[PDB]
Amino acid sequence: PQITLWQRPLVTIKIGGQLKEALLDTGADDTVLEEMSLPGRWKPKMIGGIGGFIKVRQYDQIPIEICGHKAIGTVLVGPTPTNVIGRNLLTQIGCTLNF
Amino acid sequence: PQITLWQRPLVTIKIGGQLKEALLDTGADDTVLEEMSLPGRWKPKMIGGIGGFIKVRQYDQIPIEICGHKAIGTVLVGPTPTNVIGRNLLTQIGCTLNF
Ligand SMILES: C=C(F)CO[C@H]1CO[C@@H]2OC[C@H](OC(=O)N[C@@H](Cc3ccccc3)[C@H](O)CN(CC(C)C)S(=O)(=O)c3ccc4nc(NC)oc4c3)[C@@H]21
Ligand SMILES: [Cl-]
Ligand SMILES: [Cl-]
Ligand SMILES: [Cl-]
Numbered sequence: 111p112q113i114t115l116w117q118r119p120l121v122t123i124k125i126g127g128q129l130k131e132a133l134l135d136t137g138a139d140d141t142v143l144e145e146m147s148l149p150g151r152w153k154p155k156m157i158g159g160i161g162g163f164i165k166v167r168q169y170d171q172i173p174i175e176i177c178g179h180k181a182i183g184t185v186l187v188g189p190t191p192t193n194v195i196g197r198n199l200l201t202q203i204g205c206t207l208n209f
Numbered sequence: 210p211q212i213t214l215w216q217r218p219l220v221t222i223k224i225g226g227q228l229k230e231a232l233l234d235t236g237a238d239d240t241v242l243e244e245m246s247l248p249g250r251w252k253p254k255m256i257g258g259i260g261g262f263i264k265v266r267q268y269d270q271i272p273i274e275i276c277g278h279k280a281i282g283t284v285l286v287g288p289t290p291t292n293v294i295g296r297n298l299l300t301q302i303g304c305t306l307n308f
Contacts, residue, residue: 136235190259
């Protein structure tokens, strides 16, 4: 698809058996989702943005689907005010900026 | 151009006659730059990010070039960790997301 930027670029994702809404976010290195359960090992991480840092759990090798597009990658889980899909997953679905 | 997302989408901008580096950020509604001087009067704004909120100065109708493309619009100035070009100016330069 071609996604306009007149509005926030929100998409549905499928992850850990759940459907969630998330922002396609080229300014995010990492994918960060609100509190949820995921299987497997994790390690603590601090990530920083406008306003400072939050503590998250880092889960690696998590399957996700975005717009019919399957990918796998790291998902950070913690008290983000909004779900964001970061570059680590955007690359895997072939997402580019164009102008 | 077409910009992939394997690295941060950093570009050169020009504002007030000076070159700066900034991140093309589809997850940002607005454009926020690190401390700098701009002409005219400003208005207050709070903007919220991963770690909470910051106060910024809002300047309107400011000329800014982004990767050589001319825009004129609102620029926020404050203690952001990095210069970000948000959707307010991404739309002026005709930027879309594509996959
Ligand atoms: C190295 C650090 F300290 C932090 O790294 C950031 C960048 O990569 C990491 O991935 C997740 C997180 O990414 C972001 O928070 N990205 C943000 C941009 C950013 C990049 C570097 C440093 C600070 C902010 C993000 O793309 C835009 N942000 C909103 C997202 C979280 C919904 S933002 O910076 O808080 C922002 C920017 C402009 C805005 N304009 C408005 N208008 C109401 O709200 C805004 C919010 C980590
Ligand atoms: Cl990853
Ligand atoms: Cl590619
Ligand atoms: Cl504007």
